[PDB]
Amino acid sequence: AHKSEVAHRFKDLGEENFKALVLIAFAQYLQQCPFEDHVKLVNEVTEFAKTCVADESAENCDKSLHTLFGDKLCTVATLRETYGEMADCCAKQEPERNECFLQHKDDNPNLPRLVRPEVDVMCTAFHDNEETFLKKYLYEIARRHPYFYAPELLFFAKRYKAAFTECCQAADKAACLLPKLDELRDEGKASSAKQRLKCASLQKFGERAFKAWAVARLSQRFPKAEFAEVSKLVTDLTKVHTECCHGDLLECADDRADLAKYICENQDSISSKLKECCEKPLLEKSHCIAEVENDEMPADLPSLAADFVESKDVCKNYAEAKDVFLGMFLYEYARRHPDYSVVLLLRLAKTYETTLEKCCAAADPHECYAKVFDEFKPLVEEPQNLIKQNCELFEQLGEYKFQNALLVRYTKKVPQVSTPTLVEVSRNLGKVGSKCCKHPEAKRMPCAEDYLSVVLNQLCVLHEKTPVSDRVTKCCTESLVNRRPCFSALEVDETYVPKEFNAETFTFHADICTLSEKERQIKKQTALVELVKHKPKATKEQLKAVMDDFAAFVEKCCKADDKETCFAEEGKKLVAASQAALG
Ligand SMILES: CCCCCC/C=C/CCCCCCCC(=O)O
Ligand SMILES: CCCCCC/C=C/CCCCCCCC(=O)O
Ligand SMILES: CCCCCC/C=C\CCCCCCCC(=O)O
Ligand SMILES: CCCCCC/C=C\CCCCCCCC(=O)O
């Protein structure tokens, strides 16, 4: 385990995973190296690994992984020419060498975008050589996201393999494969967006706020565990997290493996759902535990009223160790409510906290905080009702028209955002509607919280980069607890001057009869935004009526003999017919 580390890892992970992970790891530091150069390093390091597996005492096998990895990079011939100052790391010794190498990874590496090829090209190369196809895939993706946690990249790659194997043997290949690739693309973006997000909030809001989140989530996850067990897990998760944000793969991997191992030895104190996850090999344990469903809540748990409102010792128990007492409050409220979004429980803890700070300093504290549960009622119900209305609207409209409803709604709130971004955000929220509303009330709020925090990151990313609105900046730099409530609170922009009418913007051709669904939808949806941008006062009945005539327009000219001129001529009509109705 400790003697030769390379040999322990090769035995722990097996040859295939080790190769994959070594490929990923080199691809994450050496981003501008060609695949064939990467394949060659991996084969060298893999053969060197095997000598150590035969003999822990063979030469250099006793070296550390950081030493060996660093050494290997320093051999890359074009290290100075390609990577510039990254070469200068090789002058240092192996505490500092490793750290210097980690500094020079490049988040924005400036490579061209990866164009998903055609299904038949893909399925052919997959059949032609699975390993080359997949590991080239893997390299191309890893080198554009050098901070993406390597084993989680390997688990996505395994599901890439599975999708190709099922779909390249099917009748309608593209109908099978394309929707799997969209699923996998979005998870990977979400999982990368959610990694990037939780690290920044650690650095911006501190270790206390993060521990508050962890207590919430772990208690919902493990409601049968004692507070003391939950709190231990919060301390060790907080460290695992702190260290993975720093970004040293092996450091991250050891911490997580240690937490997974401790959890697997203490199941009885934590959950009865981990039996399977804990029998899995090291590579997969922590990931598996991370995604396990909530444990069943204990029967007939009592009111929080006794310990947190009615007790005469509330202020005393609070004042002697505040954060613990709030931790206990957050624990008991959260284990009773796997139906709340984590950030809703954090509102409630903060509301409680604020009332205890006020009332324990007051003339009569017991009278003062007697009704603190009344303050919770409206904060609980605000998201419940908003989920209900939006999922009702989605049931009557379907995904596509629900997106238009949203597209209109948010164009009116923030007309300054560019039209392509309004289209992407709308569409994306439509999918959140489509997934999360298929759950019953019990699970709607957790689903939305994890999907919206992805979509709302993408948005603040785009808006940090190209700002247009103070109000959008406000919500994007608030607490992560008020982020969504902030965006929800945005009113319709009443300063906005209607956009100048442009003719080409509402000029259509027969190319829309020929496009795919998505593309046709995006081009329709782009036009509805620009329409709302020119006629922002347009009512729901006026907008629907413009859409209905347009629903006829496209369907007339798309099937009525030799057709590009209707588009030109029956187009002139609709524009003017609309301009009269809206003006
Ligand atoms: C000499 C070069 C060294 C190359 C090896 C690099 C990485 C190998 C191991 C990767 C991480 C495995 C642990 C996963 C566990 C966890 O996430 O819970
Ligand atoms: C950059 C502009 C786009 C803004 C997108 C904001 C989406 C946030 C999630 C839900 C907000 C809706 C709640 C308010 C009331 C409502 O209209 O139902
Ligand atoms: C003993 C275990 C740890 C205790 C954790 C602290 C208790 C909760 C503190 C009050 C609520 C804070 C919510 C998030 C803060 C934020 O908005 O940035
Ligand atoms: C568009 C379909 C579903 C929309 C859901 C309705 C409004 C928000 C749901 C409540 C979630 C609580 C807050 C979590 C988000 C966060 O602060 O990042």
Residue 243 annotated as binding site: yes
- Are 563 and 514 contacting, i.e. CB atoms less than 8 angstroms apart? no
Q: Which of 376, 326, 344 is nearest to 446 (CA)?
A: 344
Please name each of the domains of the chain with its CATH number: 5-104 (1.10.246.10), 119-201 (1.10.246.10), 202-291 (1.10.246.10), 304-384 (1.10.246.10), 385-489 (1.10.246.10)
The amino acid sitting at 312 is K
> Does the C-beta of 487 come closer than 6 Å to ligand 2?
yes
The C-alpha atoms of residue 87 and residue 139 are separated, in whole angstroms, by 21
528 lines ligand 4 (CB under 6 A): no
Nearest CA to ligand 3 atom 13: 346
Q: How many CA atoms lie within 13 A of 414 on its CB side?
A: 25
Which residue from 10, 249, 38, 49 is spatially nearest to 135, judged by alpha carbons?
Answer: 38
From the CA of 65, how far away is ligand 1's center (Å)? 9
Q: Which of 213, 326, 331, 375 to mutate to test the pocket of ligand 3 (most atoms within 8 A of CB)?
A: 326
Q: Is 431 helix (H, G, I), strand (E, B) or coil?
A: helix
Contact 480, 224 (CB under 8 A): no
Whether the Cβ atoms of residue 287 and residue 257 lie closer than 8 Å to each other: no
Cα–Cα–Cα angle for 212, 262, 187, nearest 5°?
A: 60
Q: How many CB atoms lie within 10 A of CB 225?
A: 22
Q: Which of 307, 382, 376 shows the shortest CA–CA distance to 348?
A: 376
- Are 72 and 41 within 8 A, CB to CB? yes
At position 204, the amino acid (one-letter code) is K
Smallest CA-to-CA distance from 449 within 337, 351, 349, 350 is with 337
Reference 286, options 248, 242, 265, 255; nearest CA is 255
Q: Give the whole-angstrom CA distance, residue 19 versus residue 14.
A: 9
The resolution in Å comes to 2.5
Ligand number nearest to the C-alpha of 403: 4
Q: Please give the Cα distance from 198 to 203 (Å, whole number).
A: 9
Alpha-carbon distance of 527 to 512, in angstroms, equals: 12
Which residue carries 């007492």 as its tokens? 325
Distance 340 CA to ligand 4 centre (A): 11
Cα separation, 59 vs 38, whole angstroms: 24
Report the atom number in ligand 3 closest to the C-alpha of 201. Answer: 18
**What is the distance, to the nearest Å, from the Cα of residue 315 to the centroid of all Cα atoms in its chain?**
39
**Amino acid making up residue 147:** Y
Give the closest ligand to the alpha carbon of residue 285: 1
Q: How far is CA 135 from CA 151, 325, 406, in A?
A: 14, 51, 40
Experimental method: X-ray
> Is 172 exposed, middle or buried (CB count within 10 Å of its CB: 0-12, 13-18, 19+)?
exposed
Whether 307 has a binding-site annotation, put simply, is no
From residue 298, give the alpha-carbon distance in Å to each of 230, 344, 349.
Answer: 15, 22, 22
Query: Which of 384, 385, 386 to mutate for ligand 2's pocket (most ligand atoms within 8 Å of CB)?
Result: 386
Both tokens assigned to 401: 């028209």
Distances (CA, A) of 376 to 118, 346, 355, 481: 53, 11, 11, 15
Give me ligand 2 centre to Cα 487, in Å.
Answer: 6
| Cβ 6 under 6 angstroms from ligand 1 | yes
Q: What is the DSSP string of 178-195?
A: HHHHHHHHHHHHHHHHHH
- Helix extents (H) in 55-129: 65-75, 79-83, 96-103, 119-128
- Centre of ligand 2 from the C-alpha of residue 546, in Å: 24
Question: Backbone dihedral region of 440: left (phi > 0), alpha (psi from -120 to 50 degrees) or beta?
Answer: beta
Neighbour-count burial of 481, counting CB atoms closer than 10 A to its CB (0-12 exposed, 13-18 middle, 19+ buried): buried
Residue type, 271: S
Distance CA 406, CA 247 (A): 38
Do 190 and 454 touch, CB atoms closer than 8 A? yes
Tokens 């199941």 locate to: 267
| Residue 464 Cα distances to 288, 461, 474, angstroms | 34, 5, 11
Report DSSP state, residue 60. T
Q: Which residue has the tokens 């344990």?
A: 285
Give the H or E element holding residue 287. helix 282-290
Alpha carbon dihedral 286, 288, 293, 295, in 10-degree steps, equals -50
Q: How many angstroms is it from 319 CA to the middle of ligand 3?
A: 15
DSSP class of residue 501? P
Rounded Cα distance, 216 and 197, in Å: 18
3-state secondary structure of 440: coil
In sequence order, the 6+-apart residues with CB closer than 8 A to the CB of 127 are: 168
Residue holding tokens 């003006």? 583
The residue to mutate among 308, 330, 453, having the most atoms of ligand 3 within 8 angstroms of its beta carbon, is: 330
Compute the distance between CA of residue 502 and CA of residue 330 in angstroms, rounded to an integer: 55
Neighbouring residues of 26: CB distance < 8 A, sequence distance ≥ 6: 33, 38, 41, 42, 72, 73
For 291-444, list the strands marked E by DSSP.
Answer: none
